[PDB]
Design a protein around this ligand. Structure first.
Ligand SMILES: *C(=O)c1ccc(-c2ccc(C(=O)OCC)cn2)nc1
Ligand SMILES: *NNC(=O)c1ccc(-c2ccc(C(N)=O)cn2)nc1
Ligand SMILES: Cc1ccccc1C
Ligand SMILES: Cc1ccccc1C
Ligand SMILES: Cc1ccccc1C
Length: 9
């Protein structure tokens, strides 16, 4: 999940 949200950056 972290990756799925941090893709914003
Ligand atoms: C959430 O964005 C998230 C959580 C976990 C993973 C992920 C991707 C690949 C692996 C993997 O190859 O495991 C080998 C031990 C594990 N977890 N991606 C995204
Ligand atoms: N918010 N994330 C980004 O903007 C982002 C763009 C591109 C990449 C990335 C990572 C790894 C590779 C590679 N190993 O070829 C290419 N591009 N990460 C983040
Ligand atoms: C590597 C990967 C794949 C799918 C969604 C987000 C990210 C960071
Ligand atoms: C979609 C989502 C979920 C949890 C925290 C942040 C964001 C953008
Ligand atoms: C991480 C984030 C959050 C909201 C707008 C833009 C960006 C890059």
């Amino acid at each position: 999940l972290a990756s799925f949200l941090m893709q914003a950056l």
